[PDB]
Design a protein around this ligand. Structure first.
Ligand SMILES: O=C(O)CCCCCC(=O)C(=O)O
Ligand SMILES: O=C(O)CCCCCC(=O)C(=O)O
Ligand SMILES: [Cl-]
Ligand SMILES: [Mn+2]
Lengths: 18, 429
């Protein structure tokens, strides 16, 4: 689930370490 | 305070302390060698193994190396496999393992580690709360909900559990049910509850049910540093970017993009209508619970700065036109998409996730009456062949009360004050 128009997800970014 | 040394480790405390002194003095390379020697000489020592893992963790920070960190993640697990590990040390090691797995994006891995922690420490409520976050981070809201229900049935006034339970209910459109959990949770002041996500969604649940207390919570969220203002409530921000709800083309500096959209708007319209007529299932229903009522669907050409090749088969000339403009095609915090909205639609007041984009709307089919958009305190209408520009990190709201469909083209651009460095480095949204 991506935050496209809103802010509904617990996190909107992906985690990729450093 | 923590008891990290088992019976044998207490007998080698001088060697263990000497190695840890090296790590605390920032001599990370010497410290990894010291703990590697202790692991060689004392392979069952939990404290030696934890020291090696901590040094590898520090080294990964120093080198900014994911590979070094994967080594640390494995050593933290090794700690837990050794005999006689003191409870405090086992909990510290696996907790840091999970934390580092999340940092790397290993969310399934972190989930297994958290499940193991809850099995090993069945009375530790904070570990169940952490497991709930694990589920939320992978999008498993059903399992997260079961976890916070279990926590609340033992400790009903745990504020961390309440705000997360409230967040889940709200995401499920159980709006009225979510309000007391979000409100009581924030009011607990428990660690982890002072979070802009919970202020954001409590205020929004309040707005949806008509509770005028909403803006008091927005005001408090602003006072606590979570929101740039009570109007602009995005949570993925770059501080200091110019903040205003409505923009002119000249203010944005993207006058060449705007001229191209307005000169060429009929081709963009005609490709959208052809999809409407011949390929309407390319329009996907809005899926972020932003509607009170009505029908609204979007057909996306770019998202996160990435062209959808199959979608651009359906609007090839529009995609060809837009590819001249990396200020939008490379906007990894925005989209390029057609949007169709039908009569009887009301979109709740809402905010997008980031102040790093501005949102252009090109009017394509605009009924002469019945369509309007509010951003902050100011309401506007669209025109066919004309671009409107607003900052959708400000609260905005739309009504469609015409007698026929409305079609617009949405083009997100990087906020103009963002440097090229930032446009390269910001995580995609
Ligand atoms: O509303 C539109 O024309 C775009 C989305 C169409 C999706 C297909 C469908 O079920 C319908 O005809 O509503
Ligand atoms: O589809 C249409 O004709 C109208 C769509 C309006 C959407 C407004 C909004 O909330 C945004 O773009 O962020
Ligand atoms: Cl040993
Ligand atoms: Mn919007």
């Amino acid at each position: 689930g991506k935050c496209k128009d809103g802010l509904g997800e617990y996190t909107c970014t992906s985690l990729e370490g450093f | 305070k923590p008891k990290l040394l088992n019976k044998f480790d207490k007998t080698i405390k001088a060697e263990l302390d000497a190695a840890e002194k090296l790590r605390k003095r920032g001599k990370i390379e010497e410290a990894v060698n010291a703990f590697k020697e202790l692991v060689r000489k004392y392979p069952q020592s939990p404290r030696a193994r934890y020291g090696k893992a901590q040094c590898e963790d520090d080294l990964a920070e120093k080198r900014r190396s994911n590979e070094v960190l994967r080594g640390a993640i494995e050593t933290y697990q090794e700690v837990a496999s050794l005999p006689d590990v003191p409870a405090d040390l086992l909990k510290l090691s696996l907790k840091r393992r999970s934390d580092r797995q999340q940092f790397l994006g290993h969310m399934r891995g972190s989930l297994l580690t958290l499940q193991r922690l809850v099995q090993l420490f069945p009375n530790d409520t904070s570990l169940k709360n952490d497991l709930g976050v694990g589920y939320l981070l992978i999008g498993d809201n059903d399992n997260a909900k079961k976890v916070y229900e279990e926590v609340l049935s033992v400790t009903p006034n745990d504020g961390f559990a309440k705000v997360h339970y409230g967040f889940i209910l709200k995401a499920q459109n159980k709006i009225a049910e979510s309000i007391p959990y979000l409100k009581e949770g924030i009011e607990s002041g428990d660690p982890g509850t002072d979070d802009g996500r919970f202020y954001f969604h409590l205020g929004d649940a309040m707005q949806r049910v008509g509770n005028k207390e909403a803006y008091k919570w927005y005001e408090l969220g602003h006072k606590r540093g979570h929101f740039a203002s009570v109007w602009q409530r995005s949570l993925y921000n770059v501080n200091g970017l110019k903040a205003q709800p409505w923009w002119t083309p000249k203010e944005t500096g993207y006058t060449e993009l705007v001229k191209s959209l307005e000169r060429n708007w009929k081709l963009i319209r005609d490709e959208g209508l052809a999809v409407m007529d011949k390929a309407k299932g390319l329009f996907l229903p809005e899926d972020e619970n932003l509607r009170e009522k009505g029908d609204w669907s979007q057909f996306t050409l770019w998202q996160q700065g990435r062209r959808n090749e199959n979608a651009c088969k359906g609007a090839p000339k529009t995609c060809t036109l837009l590819e001249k403009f990396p200020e939008t095609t490379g906007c990894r915090r925005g989209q390029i998409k057609y949007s169709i909205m039908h009569p009887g639609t009301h979109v709740w007041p809402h905010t997008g996730p980031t102040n790093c984009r501005l949102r252009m709307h090109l009017g394509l089919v605009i009924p002469k009456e019945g369509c309007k958009i509010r951003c902050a305190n100011e309401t506007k209408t669209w025109e066919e062949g004309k671009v409107l520009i607003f900052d959708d990190s400000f609260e905005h709201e739309v009504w469609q009360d015409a007698s026929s469909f409305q079609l617009i083209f949405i083009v997100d651009v990087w906020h103009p004050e963002l440097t090229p460095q930032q446009r390269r480095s910001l995580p995609a949204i």
